[PDB]
Amino acid sequence: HMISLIAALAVDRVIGMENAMPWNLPADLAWFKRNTLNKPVIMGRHTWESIGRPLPGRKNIILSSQPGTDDRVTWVKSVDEAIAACGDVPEIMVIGGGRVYEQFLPKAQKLYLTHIDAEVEGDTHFPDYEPDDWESVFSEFHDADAQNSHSYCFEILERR
């Protein structure tokens, strides 16, 4: 079954700063919802803790080496178990964070990336995806506006 990563990236492919997103892009949360709704979502336990509630309309699969602590979601102990728990679906969405993106990138056939023109530091970064391995198949640049303080570009890449 097909695996896709979806992530919002600032400069340095930064995706996280102290457990939360260091910038803000409201337009990205329509894009994330659009591209994950009615698909299983795999996430690491830290990303699960940052969302506080199951993503509605999606099967939420949480990677953790410890037993689960919430029966509204599906708990798994390995990458392959996480994939198996998704069942036979057209597309599995891996929604972070850094540790989980790193493990799933070699398994993924598609990346949904938002590039945010935000100069910010963070400890967590999206994995360095090989340009030689990935073909951009969709790109749309958006200037800042009254809801988004940064310009941003929605991208979809497909694995070669």
Ligand X SMILES: NC(=O)c1ccc[n+]([C@@H]2O[C@H](COP(=O)([O-])OP(=O)(O)OC[C@H]3O[C@@H](n4cnc5c(N)ncnc54)[C@H](OP(=O)(O)O)[C@@H]3O)[C@@H](O)[C@H]2O)c1
DSSP-derived 3-state class of residue 156: strand
Q: Is 64 in the site for ligand X (CB under 6 A)?
A: yes
Cα 27 to Cα 3, 12, 33: the distances in Å are: 24, 20, 10
89 binds, among ligand FOL, ligand X, none (CB under 5 to 8 A by kind): none
C-alpha span between 111 and 85 (Å, rounded): 21
Q: Is 34 in the site for ligand FOL (CB under 6 A)?
A: no
33 binds, among ligand X, ligand FOL, none (CB under 5 to 8 A by kind): ligand FOL
Alpha helix stretches (DSSP H) within the chain: 26-36, 45-51, 79-85, 98-104
Beta-bridge partners for 116: 152
Q: Is 59 in the site for ligand X (CB under 6 A)?
A: no
Instruction: Tell me which residues in 100-159 interact with ligand FOL (CB under 6 A).
Output: none
DSSP-derived 3-state class of residue 125: strand
Q: Which of 12, 19, 29, 139 binds ligand FOL (CB under 6 A)?
A: 29
Q: Is the omega angle on the peptide bond into residue 57 within 30 degrees of 0, that is, cis?
A: no
Window 84-103: contact mask with ligand FOL (x via CB under 6 A) = -----------xx-------
Q: Is 4 in the site for ligand X (CB under 6 A)?
A: no
Sequence ranges of the binding site for substrate: 6, 28, 53, 58, 114
